[PDB]
RNA sequence: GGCAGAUCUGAGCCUGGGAGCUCUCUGCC
């Protein structure tokens, strides 16, 4: 998964 | 119990523009 935590791009498994 | 969401607007991780790991709020069954 794609997300964004504190205005940066973070991957959360797929 | 299980499920589904979650950001410079859920907290940490010394590699981190991020395939991994801890933990938790709210709704749903």
Scanning every strand, the nucleotide with its C1' closest to A9's CA turns out to be B17
Cβ contacts, strand B, under 7 angstroms? A 3-11, 13-14
- Which method was used? NMR
| Å: A2 CA to B3 C1' | 20
Strand B nucleotides, any atom under 7 Å from protein beta carbons: they are 6-9, 11, 13, 17-21
Structure tokens at A14: 């797929």
What are phi and psi for residue A7, nearest 5 degrees?
50, 25
d(CA A3, CA A7): 10
Q: Which residues partner with A2 through β-bridges?
A: A11
Q: How far is CA A5 from CA A2, A14, in A?
A: 10, 16
């Amino acid at each position: 998964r794609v997300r964004t935590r504190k205005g940066r791009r973070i991957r959360i498994x797929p």
